[PDB]
Design a protein around this nucleic acid. Sequence first.
DNA 1: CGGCCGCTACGTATC
Lengths: 83, 117, 257, 257, 14, 14
Amino acid sequence: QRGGCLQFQNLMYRGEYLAGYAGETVNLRFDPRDITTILVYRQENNQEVFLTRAHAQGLETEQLALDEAEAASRRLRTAGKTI
Amino acid sequence: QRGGCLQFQNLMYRGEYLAGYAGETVNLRFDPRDITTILVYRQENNQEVFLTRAHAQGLETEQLALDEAEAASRRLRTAGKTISNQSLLQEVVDRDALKERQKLEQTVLRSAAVDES
Amino acid sequence: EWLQAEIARLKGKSIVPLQQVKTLHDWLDGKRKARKSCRVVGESRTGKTVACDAYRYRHKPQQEAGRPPTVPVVYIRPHQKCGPKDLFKKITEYLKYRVTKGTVSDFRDRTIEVLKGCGVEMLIIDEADRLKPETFADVRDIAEDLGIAVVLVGTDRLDAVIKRDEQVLERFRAHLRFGKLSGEDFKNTVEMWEQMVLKLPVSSNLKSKEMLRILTSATEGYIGRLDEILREAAIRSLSRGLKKIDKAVLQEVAKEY
Amino acid sequence: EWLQAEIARLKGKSIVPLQQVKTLHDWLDGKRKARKSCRVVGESRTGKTVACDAYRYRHKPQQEAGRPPTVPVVYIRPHQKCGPKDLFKKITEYLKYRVTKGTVSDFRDRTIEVLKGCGVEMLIIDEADRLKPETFADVRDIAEDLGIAVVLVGTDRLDAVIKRDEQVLERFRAHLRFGKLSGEDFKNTVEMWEQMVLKLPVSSNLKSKEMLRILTSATEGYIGRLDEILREAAIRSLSRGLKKIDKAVLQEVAKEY
Amino acid sequence: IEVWDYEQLREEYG
Amino acid sequence: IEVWDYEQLREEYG
DNA sequence: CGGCCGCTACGTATC
Ligand SMILES: Nc1ncnc2c1ncn2[C@@H]1O[C@H](COP(=O)(O)OP(=O)(O)OP(=O)(O)O)[C@@H](O)[C@H]1O
Ligand SMILES: Nc1ncnc2c1ncn2[C@@H]1O[C@H](COP(=O)(O)OP(=O)(O)OP(=O)(O)O)[C@@H](O)[C@H]1O
Ligand SMILES: [Mg+2]
């Protein structure tokens, strides 16, 4: 997105080079045990290459499994609060 | 209670002589298939004596089974709405009109009980 | 023809005093004095609009001299996906001024001028959820800047939209809720439809237990179905030549649902 | 009419010296003397705008015979989808200049001139998230070029908007958060409204445990609900002739929330 | 009680 | 301790 | 301010 953001499982991520690629599609590669950091890959000459590591803004020192982020998101949507 | 009242599984009941006995203790006989009406007995000379057929006020035209009043009360508690005879009926008639295996089973079981009548 | 006179009466519309209408008019008089914003919520056939129209027909515009009309209560209804210019345009027209070509800031500056001078105390917005999300900025702005109470009317979906924004959800937190008819209240209301709206040649006795069972299953307690079922039944009764409604003819109408 | 005088008074507004307001003014003096740009954030009923009006209404404009005014602090509030021209238009009008028709660069040049002419030290932008994304280029420019502390006021959505531009995020990084009342602080504050705001003829004892349960469940700790609940209960109870607020009448007002 | 014709309220309204 | 009327603050302003 | 009395909620047992 604009300003290098990615959105994934309601978390918003930013990283060291992403803003230069705004509008492109990247392959996020992630670990379901801890989604606070994601590896971002892109395709060049039909060859996938590594781009950068993207970190969920403001929670870089925490940890979250994908199941915790998904279950908490349902509680927020049910409660009617913003995410 | 004063005003000739009995309150029971959230439902409130009124009875033909019951205002004569506010503050007293009564033995209530009821049907789990139909709790709209309560038979009221009291202790006198250390024996039960019949008193009256109390009725859920404003539900005299209506029939509630105990598991319906119970399911409506659970839903009503969790919905955060007030306790009253209609309020409980309102929390029945939507869940009635709108299925879950227990309600589907109950419908076939009911159809057998209808054929018993 | 005596029959034709009465058929023209039944297809019409009327406002009957009822406990819900009377409650709302007491509550909105409390809000109009206090200048507090609020909202009215409830299911779609409960009669929130007719209850608000009866409040617009109280508090009539006071005309004087050659001054603009003094309008205490403004009631508008937005079109689908209503923008910021569409809201001002309707406010300006309802107050009887002509809108001309300009830009957004002009509709806004002009709306605040006609809201001033001309004596507005309350603005009622029906179907509030047709508003585009940004327009709420202009609705809050008016409510805070001018001593004008704003009332938002709508269904449960309105709250689903409102909860998406804290800024709005907090100005409009107070609410009144419209419910459904039951028990003695549904039974008593059926007599008012018979003795004040229908006025059939002889009495159908709709408060009788068998007619109430038919009506209860048909209407589900909604006043917007009671008004509909009984006109449909009374038109069918009169055009077939009956002096009243009966069990089978009312079941023919109710079977259409 | 003693009643009608209290109904005319109580529907009004006041500013109370509270800890959250005294804290903001000590902080904003720090940012104004140091010329550092920053943001104030927190939930929508914490009273951030009253705390900023209490700042603007201290630090009054200074007048020198025939000079333009020396204005230490500017508070503006943008309209929805505010563009570069609308920001410059409002800053120019607030310093008491009429804005004449021109291109965006005419408004920019005149705004820079009046900010530097009126000696402005701090610019406070309320509801900052009404700004269109490009306008922050002009807000960064005002703060880079002139010795002005820009203060952005908003709620938690403002951060979701600031975080979409690295240039804004790394400048507006310093911040103060407005929080909710609790414990002794909510308890002590209820007494300040009873004795400094409501002015009822006998003590209502609102800080008692049987009354704090009612008020706690109603207000959630928001100062903007506390003032609203306690004005509405005072207006209502005086129109019934009591010299107080009591358990049942307060539970009537709280049952609307 | 009085019951209002809906088109009459429209004709009487300002 | 002092409390302020919002409208008095407006009246006292520049 | 403190005490008494209906409707829910947790713990235990058995087919
Ligand atoms: N007091 C009343 N007297 C006569 N008819 C009434 C009264 N109140 C409601 N009705 C009728 O009930 C029906 C419901 O229409 P109405 O617009 O009042 O419903 P509503 O709940 O406002 O609907 P929506 O939520 O879709 O706007 C209409 O036919 C209306 O004429
Ligand atoms: N310090 C205070 N003294 C007196 N009354 C206050 C104070 N703070 C808030 N209030 C009252 O509570 C209301 C809170 O609304 P306010 O505009 O202060 O909140 P806000 O944080 O600016 O809201 P938002 O972020 O949604 O714009 C005020 O309008 C006023 O009635
Ligand atoms: Mg504000």
